[PDB]
Design a protein around this ligand. Structure first.
Ligand code: EQU
Ligand code: EQU
Lengths: 126, 126
């Protein structure tokens, strides 16, 4: 919980950039060795870098996916933040957009220790 | 964890409407009797309707606080949702805005069991 509120905003905005460019390896480097991801929130967690890498490779490696912040990063003083963003993709030739909110907790080294993504079919658009 | 994702979106949007009008009575009844609120996230939890009512009583006090959703409510399938919104008030003279993200978990009765508000000074503008 060492990153400042300002640092958290920057780290979170960076993450979106890496997702937008699709640099799978740079995204995985942002996560702690033992990070846990819940995406979508409510599903069993993804534990560790190896499994976390598989998620991003499978989700971003495929077609063309774009991601943009749709509002400012809300940052707390205990190394946590939440951000609203939109993910654009094509599903079976159908152009789609998914609205998502990610909540992240960072460790003392500025690495993502926990990530939870809030979204469901209700957040899907065309 | 029983309201559907569509129900969560409705409940959360209603909450913003009540905050906007300042209906402190209706807000408190949205909460479970032993609910917990962490606002701002990082600060110690306020528990139970009495304490929660005090928060809204003093925060929305006079009636010069406006609140509006600034994007869709993201809802999961386990009774949780997260939403982006802006609060407008006055800092002893000059009008300012605060960008916040609320994450809420609902119970089998459609009542807010837990609420966490993400924000800090980095989200305050004049
Ligand atoms: C995996 C995915 C692309 C990336 C992505 C999704 C959902 C939530 C995300 C949250 C992130 O923080 C980063 C990327 C995604 C989509 C779900 C459907 C899809 O194609
Ligand atoms: C209390 C407050 C007005 C309402 C409000 C604030 C912060 C987080 C909130 C979260 C809510 O879910 C509902 C209302 C607020 C502001 C903090 C400074 C202020 O004037």
């Amino acid at each position: 919980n060492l990153p400042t509120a300002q640092e958290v905003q920057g780290l979170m905005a960076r993450y979106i950039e890496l997702v937008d460019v699709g640099d799978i390896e740079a995204i995985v480097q942002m996560y702690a060795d033992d990070a846990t991801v819940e995406n979508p929130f409510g599903q069993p967690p993804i534990h560790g870098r190896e499994q976390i890498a598989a998620f991003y490779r499978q989700g971003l490696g495929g077609g063309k996916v774009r991601a943009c912040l749709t509002g400012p990063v809300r940052a707390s003083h205990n190394g946590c933040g939440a951000m609203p963003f939109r993910v654009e993709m094509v599903w079976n030739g159908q152009p789609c957009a998914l609205d998502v909110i990610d909540v992240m907790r960072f460790d003392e080294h500025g690495r993502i220790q926990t990530m939870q993504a809030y979204w469901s079919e209700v957040n899907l658009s065309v």
